[PDB]
Design a protein around this nucleic acid. Structure first.
Length: 48
RNA sequence: CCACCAACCCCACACACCCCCCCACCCCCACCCACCACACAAAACCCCCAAAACCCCCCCAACCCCCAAACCCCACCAACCCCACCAACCCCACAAACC
């Protein structure tokens, strides 16, 4: 539900969960990231 | 570093479907005598003349030490980011855009 997601974001203080970051990096890293793509952004932003 | 409509297994004649099959067969077994890729005997350390045996030795000797003065592969001065044109800086920008 929209209400469920919103509360869950509020509970974590509007900050990404570590699992969210793990998922983003695993997708971005296992891809031939294009110059200004979303993959490149994900890779450059969350990598350590 | 999406896209022709549409269809969207690099599926589909039928019959079929072990890269099975002639039969006898079926150790890439078999003549016999054999059967250590053993063997003349004498004999077997790829041992031996003696004298010997550091691939030791003339002596002086014995740092691949030494003129002297010396001894940072220091030193003119000015210096001393292998900094510096300004304007200033994403190796950003027409617009429209952005599998």
């Amino acid at each position: 539900s929209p209400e469920a997601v919103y509360t869950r974001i509020m509970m974590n203080g509007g900050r990404l969960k570590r699992s969210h970051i793990r998922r983003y990096v695993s997708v971005s890293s296992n891809h031939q990231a294009r110059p200004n793509s979303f993959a490149e952004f994900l890779n450059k932003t969350y990598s350590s």
